[PDB]
CSV table of C-alpha atoms in Angstrom, one decimal:
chain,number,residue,atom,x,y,z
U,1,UNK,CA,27.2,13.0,-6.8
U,2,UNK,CA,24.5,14.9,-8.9
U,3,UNK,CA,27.2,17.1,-9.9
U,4,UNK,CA,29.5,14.2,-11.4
U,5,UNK,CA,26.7,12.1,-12.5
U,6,UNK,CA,26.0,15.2,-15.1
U,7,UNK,CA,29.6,15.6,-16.0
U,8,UNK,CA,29.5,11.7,-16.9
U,9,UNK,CA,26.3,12.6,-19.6
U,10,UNK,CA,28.6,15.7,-20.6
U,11,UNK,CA,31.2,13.3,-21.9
U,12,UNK,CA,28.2,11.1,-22.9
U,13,UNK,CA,27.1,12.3,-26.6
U,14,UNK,CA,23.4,13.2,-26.5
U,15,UNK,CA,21.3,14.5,-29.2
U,16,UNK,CA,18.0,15.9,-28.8
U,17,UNK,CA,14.9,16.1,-31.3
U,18,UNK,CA,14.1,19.3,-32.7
U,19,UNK,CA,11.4,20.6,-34.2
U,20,UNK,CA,11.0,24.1,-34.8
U,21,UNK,CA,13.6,24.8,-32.8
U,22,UNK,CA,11.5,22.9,-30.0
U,23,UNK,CA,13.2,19.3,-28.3
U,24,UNK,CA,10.3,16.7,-28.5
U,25,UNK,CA,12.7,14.5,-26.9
U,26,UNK,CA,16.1,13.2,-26.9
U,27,UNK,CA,17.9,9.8,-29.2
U,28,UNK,CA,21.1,8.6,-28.3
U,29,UNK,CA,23.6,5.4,-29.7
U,30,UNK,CA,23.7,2.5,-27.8
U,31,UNK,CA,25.0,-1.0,-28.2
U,32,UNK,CA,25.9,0.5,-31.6
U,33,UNK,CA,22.7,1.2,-32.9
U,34,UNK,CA,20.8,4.5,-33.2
U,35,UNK,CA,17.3,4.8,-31.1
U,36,UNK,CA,14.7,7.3,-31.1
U,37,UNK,CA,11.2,7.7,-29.6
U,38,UNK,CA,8.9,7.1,-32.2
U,39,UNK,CA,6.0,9.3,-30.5
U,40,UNK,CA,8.5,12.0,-30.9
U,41,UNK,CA,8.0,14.3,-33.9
U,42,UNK,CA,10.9,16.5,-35.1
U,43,UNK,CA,14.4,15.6,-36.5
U,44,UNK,CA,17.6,13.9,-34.1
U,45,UNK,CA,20.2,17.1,-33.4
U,46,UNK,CA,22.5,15.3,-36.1
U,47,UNK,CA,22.7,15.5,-39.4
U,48,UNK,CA,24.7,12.6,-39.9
U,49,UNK,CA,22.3,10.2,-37.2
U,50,UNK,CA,19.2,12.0,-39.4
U,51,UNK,CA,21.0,10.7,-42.9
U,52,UNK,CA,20.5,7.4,-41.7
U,53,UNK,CA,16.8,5.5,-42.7
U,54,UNK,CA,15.2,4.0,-39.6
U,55,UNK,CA,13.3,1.2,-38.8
U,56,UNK,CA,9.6,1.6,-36.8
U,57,UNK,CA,8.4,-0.7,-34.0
U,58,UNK,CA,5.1,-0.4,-33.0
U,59,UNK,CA,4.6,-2.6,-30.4
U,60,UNK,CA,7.0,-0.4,-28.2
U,61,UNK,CA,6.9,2.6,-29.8
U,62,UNK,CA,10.2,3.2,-30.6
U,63,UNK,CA,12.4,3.6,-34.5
U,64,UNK,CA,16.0,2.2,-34.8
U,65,UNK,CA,18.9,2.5,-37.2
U,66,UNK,CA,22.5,0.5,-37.6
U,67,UNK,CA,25.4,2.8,-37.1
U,68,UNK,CA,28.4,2.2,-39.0
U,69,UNK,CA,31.2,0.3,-37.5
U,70,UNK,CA,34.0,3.2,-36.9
U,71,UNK,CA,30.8,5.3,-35.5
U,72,UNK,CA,30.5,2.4,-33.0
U,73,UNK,CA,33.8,2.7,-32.0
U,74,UNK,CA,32.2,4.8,-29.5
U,75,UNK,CA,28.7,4.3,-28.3
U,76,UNK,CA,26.6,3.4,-25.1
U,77,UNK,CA,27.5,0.3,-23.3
U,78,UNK,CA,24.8,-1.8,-21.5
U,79,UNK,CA,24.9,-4.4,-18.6
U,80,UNK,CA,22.7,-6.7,-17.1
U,81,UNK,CA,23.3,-5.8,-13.6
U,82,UNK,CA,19.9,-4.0,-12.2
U,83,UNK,CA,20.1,-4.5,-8.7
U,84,UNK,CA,18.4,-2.3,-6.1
U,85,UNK,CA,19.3,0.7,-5.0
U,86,UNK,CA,19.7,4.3,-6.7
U,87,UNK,CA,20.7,5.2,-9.9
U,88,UNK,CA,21.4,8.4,-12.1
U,89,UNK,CA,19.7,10.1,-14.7
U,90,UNK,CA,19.9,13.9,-16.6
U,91,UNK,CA,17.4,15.0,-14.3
U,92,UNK,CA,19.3,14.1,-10.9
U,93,UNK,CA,18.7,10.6,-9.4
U,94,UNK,CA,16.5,8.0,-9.6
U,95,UNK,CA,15.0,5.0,-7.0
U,96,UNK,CA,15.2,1.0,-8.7
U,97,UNK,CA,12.7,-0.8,-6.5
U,98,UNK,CA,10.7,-3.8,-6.7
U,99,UNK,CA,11.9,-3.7,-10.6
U,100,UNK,CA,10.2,-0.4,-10.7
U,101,UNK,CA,11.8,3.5,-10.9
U,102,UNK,CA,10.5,6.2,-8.8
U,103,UNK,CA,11.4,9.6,-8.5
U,104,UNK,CA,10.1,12.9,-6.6
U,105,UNK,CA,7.4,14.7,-8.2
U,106,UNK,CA,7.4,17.4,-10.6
U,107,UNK,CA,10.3,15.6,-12.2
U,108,UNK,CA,10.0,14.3,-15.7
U,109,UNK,CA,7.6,15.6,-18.2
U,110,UNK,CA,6.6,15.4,-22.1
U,111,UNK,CA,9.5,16.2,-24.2
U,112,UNK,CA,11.8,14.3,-21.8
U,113,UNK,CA,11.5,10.8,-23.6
U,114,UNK,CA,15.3,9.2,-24.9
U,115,UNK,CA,17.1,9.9,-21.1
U,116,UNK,CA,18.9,6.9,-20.0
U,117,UNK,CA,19.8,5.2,-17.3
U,118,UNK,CA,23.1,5.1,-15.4
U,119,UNK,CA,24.8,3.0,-13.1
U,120,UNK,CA,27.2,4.1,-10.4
U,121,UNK,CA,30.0,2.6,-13.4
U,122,UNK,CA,27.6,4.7,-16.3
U,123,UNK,CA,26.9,2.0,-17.7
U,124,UNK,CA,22.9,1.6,-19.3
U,125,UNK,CA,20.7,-0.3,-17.2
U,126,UNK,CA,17.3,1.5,-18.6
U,127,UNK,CA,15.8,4.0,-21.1
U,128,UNK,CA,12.8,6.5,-20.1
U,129,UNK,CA,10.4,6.5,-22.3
U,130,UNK,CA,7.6,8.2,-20.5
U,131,UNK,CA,6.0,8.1,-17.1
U,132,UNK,CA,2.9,8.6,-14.6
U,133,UNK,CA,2.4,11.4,-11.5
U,134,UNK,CA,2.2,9.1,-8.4
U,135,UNK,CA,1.6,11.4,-5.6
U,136,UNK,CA,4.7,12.5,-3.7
U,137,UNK,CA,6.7,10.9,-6.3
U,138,UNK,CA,6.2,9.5,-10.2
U,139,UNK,CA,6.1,6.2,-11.2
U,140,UNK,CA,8.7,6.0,-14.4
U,141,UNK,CA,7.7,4.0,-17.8
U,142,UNK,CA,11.1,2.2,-19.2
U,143,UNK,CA,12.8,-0.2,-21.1
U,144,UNK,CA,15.0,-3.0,-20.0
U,145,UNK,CA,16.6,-6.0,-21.6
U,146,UNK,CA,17.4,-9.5,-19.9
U,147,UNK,CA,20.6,-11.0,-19.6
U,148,UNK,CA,19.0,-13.7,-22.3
U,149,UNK,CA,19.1,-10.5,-24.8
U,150,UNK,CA,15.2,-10.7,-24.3
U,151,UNK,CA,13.8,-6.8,-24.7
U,152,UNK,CA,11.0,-6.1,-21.7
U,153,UNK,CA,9.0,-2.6,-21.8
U,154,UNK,CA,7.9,-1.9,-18.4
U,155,UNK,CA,4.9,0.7,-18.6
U,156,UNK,CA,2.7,1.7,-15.7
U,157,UNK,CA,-0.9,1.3,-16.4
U,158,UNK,CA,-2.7,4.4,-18.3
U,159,UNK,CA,0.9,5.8,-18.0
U,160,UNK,CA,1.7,9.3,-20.2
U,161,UNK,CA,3.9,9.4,-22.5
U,162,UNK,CA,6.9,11.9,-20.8
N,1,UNK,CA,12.6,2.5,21.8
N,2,UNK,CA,8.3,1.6,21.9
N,3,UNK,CA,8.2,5.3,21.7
N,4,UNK,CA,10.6,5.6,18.7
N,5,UNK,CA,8.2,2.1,16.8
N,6,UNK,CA,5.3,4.1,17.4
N,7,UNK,CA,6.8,7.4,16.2
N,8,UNK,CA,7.3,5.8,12.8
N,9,UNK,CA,4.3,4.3,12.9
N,10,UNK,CA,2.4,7.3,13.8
N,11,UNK,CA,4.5,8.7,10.2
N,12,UNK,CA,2.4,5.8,8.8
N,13,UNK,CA,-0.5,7.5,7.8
N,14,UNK,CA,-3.7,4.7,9.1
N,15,UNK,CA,-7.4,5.6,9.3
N,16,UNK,CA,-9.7,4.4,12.2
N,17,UNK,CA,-13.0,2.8,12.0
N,18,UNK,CA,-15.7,5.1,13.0
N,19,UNK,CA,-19.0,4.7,14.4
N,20,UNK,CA,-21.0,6.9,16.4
N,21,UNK,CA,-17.8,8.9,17.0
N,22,UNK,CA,-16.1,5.4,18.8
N,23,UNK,CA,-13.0,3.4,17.1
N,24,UNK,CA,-14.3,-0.1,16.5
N,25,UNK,CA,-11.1,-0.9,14.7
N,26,UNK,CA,-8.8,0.2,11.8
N,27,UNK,CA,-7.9,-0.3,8.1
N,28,UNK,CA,-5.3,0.9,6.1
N,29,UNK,CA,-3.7,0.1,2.3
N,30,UNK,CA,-1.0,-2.1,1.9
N,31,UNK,CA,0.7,-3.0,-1.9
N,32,UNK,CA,-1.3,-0.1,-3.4
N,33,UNK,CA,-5.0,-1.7,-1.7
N,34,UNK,CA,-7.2,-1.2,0.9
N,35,UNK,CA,-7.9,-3.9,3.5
N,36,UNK,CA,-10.5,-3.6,6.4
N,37,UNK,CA,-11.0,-6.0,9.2
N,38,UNK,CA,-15.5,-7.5,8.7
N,39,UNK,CA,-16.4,-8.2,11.8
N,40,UNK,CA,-15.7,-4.1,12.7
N,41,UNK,CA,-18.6,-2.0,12.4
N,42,UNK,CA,-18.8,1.6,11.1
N,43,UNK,CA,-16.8,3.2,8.5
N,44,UNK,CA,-13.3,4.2,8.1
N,45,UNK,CA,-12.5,7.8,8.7
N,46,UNK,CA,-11.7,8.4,5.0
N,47,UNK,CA,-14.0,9.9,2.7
N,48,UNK,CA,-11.9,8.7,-0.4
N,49,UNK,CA,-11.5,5.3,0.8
N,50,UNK,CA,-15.0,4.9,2.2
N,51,UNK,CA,-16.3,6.1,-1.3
N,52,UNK,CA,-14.8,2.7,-2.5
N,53,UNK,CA,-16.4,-0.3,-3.0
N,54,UNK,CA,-15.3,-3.0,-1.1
N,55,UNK,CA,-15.2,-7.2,-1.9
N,56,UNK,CA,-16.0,-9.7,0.8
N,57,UNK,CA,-13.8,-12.5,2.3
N,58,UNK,CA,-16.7,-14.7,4.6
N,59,UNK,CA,-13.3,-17.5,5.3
N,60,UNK,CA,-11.2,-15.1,6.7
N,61,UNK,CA,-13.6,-12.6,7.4
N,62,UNK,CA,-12.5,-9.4,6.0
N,63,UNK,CA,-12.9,-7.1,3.2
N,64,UNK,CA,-11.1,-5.2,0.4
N,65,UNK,CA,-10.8,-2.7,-2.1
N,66,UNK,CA,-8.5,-0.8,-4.8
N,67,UNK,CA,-7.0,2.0,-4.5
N,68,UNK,CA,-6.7,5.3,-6.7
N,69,UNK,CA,-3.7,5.1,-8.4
N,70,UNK,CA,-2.8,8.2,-7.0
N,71,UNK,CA,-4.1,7.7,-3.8
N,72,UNK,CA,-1.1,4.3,-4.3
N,73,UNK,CA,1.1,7.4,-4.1
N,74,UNK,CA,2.1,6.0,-0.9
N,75,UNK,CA,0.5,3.1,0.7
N,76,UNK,CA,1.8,0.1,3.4
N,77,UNK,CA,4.8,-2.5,2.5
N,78,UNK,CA,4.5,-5.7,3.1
N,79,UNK,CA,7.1,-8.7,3.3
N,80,UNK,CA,7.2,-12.0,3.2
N,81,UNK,CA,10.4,-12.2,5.5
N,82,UNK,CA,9.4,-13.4,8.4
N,83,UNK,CA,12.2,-14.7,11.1
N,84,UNK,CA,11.8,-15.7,14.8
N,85,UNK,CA,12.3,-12.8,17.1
N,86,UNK,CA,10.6,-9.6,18.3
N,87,UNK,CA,8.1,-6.7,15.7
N,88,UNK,CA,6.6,-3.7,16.0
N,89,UNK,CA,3.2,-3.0,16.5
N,90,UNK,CA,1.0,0.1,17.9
N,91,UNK,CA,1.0,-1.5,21.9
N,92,UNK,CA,4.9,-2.0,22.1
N,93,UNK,CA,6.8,-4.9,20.6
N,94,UNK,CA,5.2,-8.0,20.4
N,95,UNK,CA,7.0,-11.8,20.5
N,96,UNK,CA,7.2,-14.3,17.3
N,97,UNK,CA,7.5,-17.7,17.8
N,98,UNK,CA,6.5,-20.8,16.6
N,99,UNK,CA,4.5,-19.1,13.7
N,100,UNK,CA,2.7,-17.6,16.5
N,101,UNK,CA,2.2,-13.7,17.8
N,102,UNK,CA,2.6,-14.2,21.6
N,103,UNK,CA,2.3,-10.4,23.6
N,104,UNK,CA,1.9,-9.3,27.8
N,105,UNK,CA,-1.6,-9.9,29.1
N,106,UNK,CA,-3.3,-6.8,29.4
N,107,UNK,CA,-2.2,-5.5,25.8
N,108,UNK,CA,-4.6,-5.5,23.0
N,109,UNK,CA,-8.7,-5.6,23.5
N,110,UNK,CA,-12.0,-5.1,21.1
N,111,UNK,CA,-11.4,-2.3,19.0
N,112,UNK,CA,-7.7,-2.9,18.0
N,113,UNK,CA,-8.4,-4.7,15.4
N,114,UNK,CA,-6.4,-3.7,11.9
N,115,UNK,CA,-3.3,-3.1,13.3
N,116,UNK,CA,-0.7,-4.6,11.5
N,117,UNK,CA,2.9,-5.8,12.8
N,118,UNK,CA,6.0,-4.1,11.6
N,119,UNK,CA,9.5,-5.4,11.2
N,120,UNK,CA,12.5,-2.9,11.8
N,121,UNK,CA,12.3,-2.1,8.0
N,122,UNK,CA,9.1,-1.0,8.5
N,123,UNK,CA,7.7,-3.3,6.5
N,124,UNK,CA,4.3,-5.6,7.4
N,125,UNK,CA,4.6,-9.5,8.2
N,126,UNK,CA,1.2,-9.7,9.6
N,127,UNK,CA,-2.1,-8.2,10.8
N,128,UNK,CA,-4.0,-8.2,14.5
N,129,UNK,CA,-7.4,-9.1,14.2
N,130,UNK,CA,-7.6,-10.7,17.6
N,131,UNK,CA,-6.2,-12.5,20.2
N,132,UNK,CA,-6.8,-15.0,23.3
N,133,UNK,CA,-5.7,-14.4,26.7
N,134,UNK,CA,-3.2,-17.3,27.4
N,135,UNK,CA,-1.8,-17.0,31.2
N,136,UNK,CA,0.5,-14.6,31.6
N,137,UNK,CA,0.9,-13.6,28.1
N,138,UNK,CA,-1.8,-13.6,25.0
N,139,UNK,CA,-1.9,-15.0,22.1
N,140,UNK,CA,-2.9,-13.2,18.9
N,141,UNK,CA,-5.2,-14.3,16.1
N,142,UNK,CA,-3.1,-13.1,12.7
N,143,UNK,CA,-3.6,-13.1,9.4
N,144,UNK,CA,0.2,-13.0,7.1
N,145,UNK,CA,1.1,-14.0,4.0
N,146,UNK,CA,3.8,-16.6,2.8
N,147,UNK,CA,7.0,-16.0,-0.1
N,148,UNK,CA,4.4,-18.7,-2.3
N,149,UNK,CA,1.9,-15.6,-1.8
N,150,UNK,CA,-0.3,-18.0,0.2
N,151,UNK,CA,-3.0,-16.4,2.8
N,152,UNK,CA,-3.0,-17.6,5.9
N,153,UNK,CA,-5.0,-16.9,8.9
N,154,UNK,CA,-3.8,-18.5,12.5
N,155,UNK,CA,-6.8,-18.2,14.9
N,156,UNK,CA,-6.8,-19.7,18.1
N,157,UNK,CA,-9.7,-21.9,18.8
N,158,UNK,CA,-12.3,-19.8,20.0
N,159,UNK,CA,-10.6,-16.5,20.0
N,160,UNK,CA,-11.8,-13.6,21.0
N,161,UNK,CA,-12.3,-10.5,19.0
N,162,UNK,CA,-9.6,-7.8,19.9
């Protein structure tokens, strides 16, 4: 499954943050709108997303930009539909429980902020935006939106920024 | 199948209470916090946990504490699902009915106290802190909590400490 769920963010355009020739993270289009991690110094992987002037929000830490109309022609679609279960990410899969994700340890770390999250259809349930080590697995800081439109951070307490 | 309920709970990582090298009872964590049953003297058999401090609870006679959030690596989950039928607990299966924990006579004394009863999830719908020898059977002096999130303790009147 791994296997396809990677050839799914293949097809999916990704663009990561560079910075001296070092990724501070990762920005990505969805809903037709450009979003990147504001902690996250360094320049989008796109000269064309980087032209664009964004817009900061501090209360979740996190810039965004319009993207014109024939660039939306093709961007990230998100749904509503969080239900239990497993779901898949760049770095393998991931466990939705109790509202919460969860994955094994030594999985996810700084510089990993911007990955989505993918349903079994690949469509975007969540972004990671950080995390914190939870023993045997780690306890995943994201960002979800309701099916009123309503934008919801979910972040762990004391939780580091991955 | 006892031997296959006891197997997983024996995965279950609990602690007994210790003193003078003799189990007086147990306590474990549950939703990321430690529980201990009062009326058991001695301490658990858990440096970390014993370095806690612990609140009080005189009306239902136990006490508490937070956990480490990386001791909450993996802790005890509880549920609030809690049909008619037959659970799991560390002296066989034990019979529900009538809001009631009803087991064999001859199962369960002093010094059981903190083991908690398991569904086939493995998930908690109650804990033993004593019981009341009632014919041919016994019945068992719980402590559960309801969907509203309600405590509830159901002693029989004069119940002995198991």
């Amino acid at each position: 499954k791994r296997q396809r769920m990677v050839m799914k963010l293949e097809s999916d355009k990704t663009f990561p943050i560079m910075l001296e020739g070092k990724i501070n993270g990762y920005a990505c289009v969805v809903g037709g709108k450009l979003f990147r991690p504001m902690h996250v110094e360094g320049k989008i992987d796109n000269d064309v997303l980087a032209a664009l002037k964004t817009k900061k929000a501090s209360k979740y830490d996190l810039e965004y930009a319009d993207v014109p109309q024939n660039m939306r022609a093709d961007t990230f679609k998100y749904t509503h539909e969080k239900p239990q279960g497993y779901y898949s990410w760049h770095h393998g899969a991931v466990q939705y429980e109790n509202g919460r994700f969860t994955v094994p340890k030594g999985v996810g770390a700084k510089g990993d902020s911007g990955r989505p999250i993918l349903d079994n259809q690949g469509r975007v349930v969540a972004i990671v935006l950080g995390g914190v080590n939870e023993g045997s697995r780690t306890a995943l800081s994201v960002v979800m939106w309701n099916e009123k439109g309503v934008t919801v951070k979910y972040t762990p307490e004391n939780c580091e920024q991955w």
